[PDB]
Structures are given as structure tokens and as C-alpha cells.
Amino acid sequence: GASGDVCQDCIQMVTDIQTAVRTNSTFVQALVEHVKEECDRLGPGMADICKNYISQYSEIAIQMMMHMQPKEICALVGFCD
Amino acid sequence: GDVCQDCIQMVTDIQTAVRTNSTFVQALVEHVKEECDRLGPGMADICKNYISQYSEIAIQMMMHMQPKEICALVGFCD
Numbered sequence: 001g002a003s004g005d006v007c008q009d010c011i012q013m014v015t016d017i018q019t020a021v022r023t024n025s026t027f028v029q030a031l032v033e034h035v036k037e038e039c040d041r042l043g044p045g046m047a048d049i050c051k052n053y054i055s056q057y058s059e060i061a062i063q064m065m066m067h068m069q070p071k072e073i074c075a076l077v078g079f080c081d
Numbered sequence: 082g083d084v085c086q087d088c089i090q091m092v093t094d095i096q097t098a099v100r101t102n103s104t105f106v107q108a109l110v111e112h113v114k115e116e117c118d119r120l121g122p123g124m125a126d127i128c129k130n131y132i133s134q135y136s137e138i139a140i141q142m143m144m145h146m147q148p149k150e151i152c153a154l155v156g157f158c159d
């Protein structure tokens with residue numbers, strides 16, 4: 001059903017994200033920089049803290065993500081199971 | 082390019098799931114709240130409260146945005 005379609009879509013997306021992290025040298029940098037820019041949407045005070053949190057934990061989060069299976073990442077976010 | 086299209090496909094199906102499955106949103110929000118426990122004591126409650134404060138906003142914004150817009154917002158497209 002529809003929930004089942006979302007799960008498979010997530011597995012497909014996550015598999016390709018991992019292939020991008022391994023084969024595209026500018027992928028991670030472009031994503032992290034973009035998410036830092038999105039911190040501006042939260043507030044004047046919140047944006048500075050948000051940007052600092054991403055800078056601090058981005059590498060570890062990507063490294064953690066890379067040692068997980070696509071279905072595990074999707075089950076973690078809630079798109080699978 | 083593949084990631085962008087995968088995101089558009091996933092987001093289109095999420096919007097279909099929200100419109101056709103009456104328990105989808107509730108199950109997702111409750112699941113993400115349960116995942117806050119991985120942050121351990123102290124941080125778990127702060128995380129659960131952030132979910133309870135932004136879930137409606139995030140879901141409504143997501144339901145009124147096009148799949149490509151949501152994907153460009155997260156950074157998977159453009």
C-alpha cells in the first residue's frame with residue numbers, strides 16, 4: 001500500500017545517497033552548507049545555534065549514516081516498518 | 082541527479098500516504114518521538130517537546146509544498 005511505497009522509495013533514495021557520498025566528492029559539502037543556510041528560517045537567535053550544531057556534528061552524523069543499511073536508516077526516520 | 086528524483090518520488094508517495102492513510106501522520110510523529118530516547122536522559126524530553134511543537138507546522142508546510150520544493154528545501158534537489 002501507500003505506506004509500503006514510501007518505505008521502498010526511502011530505501012532507493014538512501015541507497016543512492018550512500019553511492020553519492022562514496023562517488024561524488026562535493027555531495028556532502030553541498031548538502032551540509034545548504035542545511036546551514038536553512039537554519040536562517042528558525043529565527044535571529046536560533047539560526048546561530050542551529051549553524052553551530054550542524055558544523056559540530058555533520059561529519060559524525062554522515063559517518064554514522066554510512067555504516068547503516070538503507071532499510072535501517074529508513075526504519076530510524078519512520079518511513080520503514 | 083538520482084537522489085533528487087528519488088526524493089521527488091518519495092515525497093509524492095508521502096503526500097499520497099497522508100491523503101489516503103488516516104493513521105500515517107500519527108504513526109510517523111509517535112515513532113520520531115520514540116527515537117528521541119536514543120539521545121539518552123535530559124536530551125530525550127527536549128527532543129520530544131521539539132517534535133510536539135513543530136510537527137503540525139512541518140506536516141502542514143510539507144502538505145502545501147510541491148515534492149520538488151520540499152526536496153530543494155532539504156537539499157536533495159537543485
Ligand SMILES: CCN(CC)CCC[C@@H](C)Nc1ccnc2cc(Cl)ccc12
Nearest residue numbers: 061064065067068069072076116119120
Ligand atoms: C539517532 C542516532 N543515530 C544517528 C543517526 C544513531 C543510529 C543508531 C541505530 C539506530 N542504527 C543501527 C545501526 C546498526 N545496526 C542497527 C540494527 C538495528 Cl535492529 C537497528 C538499528 C541499527
